[PDB]
Structure formats: structure tokens, C-alpha cells
Amino acid sequence: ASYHISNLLEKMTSSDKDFRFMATNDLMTELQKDSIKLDDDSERKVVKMILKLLEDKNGEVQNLAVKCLGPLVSKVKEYQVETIVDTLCTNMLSDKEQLRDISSIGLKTVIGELPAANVCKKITGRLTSAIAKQEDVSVQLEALDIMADMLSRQGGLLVNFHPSILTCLLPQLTSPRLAVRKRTIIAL
């Protein structure tokens, strides 16, 4: 009911780790088993709460939120999926390494969960500029890994975006780092 969701959301900010871990586990196990009559405002609060918890200072809560992100996207309106993808993409470019790793893991989990078309198009549009020859080697590595995983999972779609992917991947073959060369070879 709405009361249970409200109390879980309220207790998710109890400043105590045990309370923060139990409520998130309850939310995850409720979403995993046929969540009933979740009003749009409840989706909004749940998405915002999970995104904020992804920045928590304890590893256990962040890991549980990352795992919960998967079953969440199974039943939500497409707009929340788009804004979650956008938030993960902009957090991937953050200077903090923990945020980059968390966003990459969340995006990989989302890609693995997804069997839907516009999400992949937006992700590819972001990664095309991400992989470009810039001064951040780690960002290039993460974007290459994400695109390789996305291509391995599904390749039937993105018919019109393949030339752009090839055009961005080709200059990476002469990068001084051999790991970049191997990763772009795998992506090709």
C-alpha cells in the first residue's frame, strides 16, 4: 500500500546503516515479486531515493542499490528509464572514481536486464562522444567496455548508428596504450 512505501521512504533517511540496509532490501524484494499498484509519484520518489543512495558513504548500501536497480527497470514508465540513463551518463563523466565505477556497474546491469530501443540509441549517442580521443583514459576504457557489452548483448537494432560507431572506433586503433587497442579490437 501507499503507507508501506511512505514509511520505507521515510526510514531510508534514518542515518543508521542497519535501517538503510533493511528498507532497501525490502524494497528490492517487493519490486522483484510483482509490485502492486505503484503510483507514478511512488516511482518518482523510488528512483530519486535509489539514485541518492548510489552516492552513500557505505559500500553495502551502494551495492544493494546497484543490485536493486536491475529489477526496478523491469516495470517503470519509459521516462523514468530515460532520466535514469541520463543521470548515469552524466555521473560517468564525474571526477570521482567511485561515482564512475558505480555508474558503469549500474549501466551494465541495466543493459543486461534489457532484452528498449531509444534507451540504447541514447546510450550509444553518449558513448560515441565519450570514446572520442580525449585526455581521460579511464573514461575511454569504461565507455569501450560498455559499448562492447551492449553490442554483445544485442546487435539487431542500431542499424543506422553503425557508421558512427565505426568512425569513432577506427582512430582508437593507433592509441599508445595497448589495452585501448585490444578493447577497440574486441568492440570492432
Tell me which of 17, 52, 77, 177 binds other proteins, using CB under 8 A.
Answer: 17
Q: Which amino acid is at 20?
A: R
Pick from 94, 156, 157, 96: nearest CA to 122: 157
Helix (H, G, I), strand (E, B) or coil at 8: helix
Residues touching other proteins, count (CB under 8 A): 5
- Number of alpha carbons in the 13 Å side-chain half-sphere of residue 14: 15
Return the residue of 1, 3, 15, 176 that touches other proteins, per CB under 8 A. Answer: 15
Which residue in the set 1, 33, 57, 160 belongs to the binding site for other proteins (CB under 8 A)? 57
Residue numbers after which the chain is interrupted (C to N above 2.5 A) read 115
| Closer residue to other proteins (CB): 33 or 57 | 57
Stretch that binds other proteins, among 13-21, 64-72, 83-91, 173-181 (CB under 8 A): 13-21
For residues 5-25, b (16+ Cβ closer than 10 Å) or e, as one string? beebbeebeeeeeeebeebbe
Interface map 88-127 toward other proteins (x if CB under 8 A):
----------------------------------------
Residues forming contacts to other proteins in the complex (CB under 8 A) are 15-17, 57-58
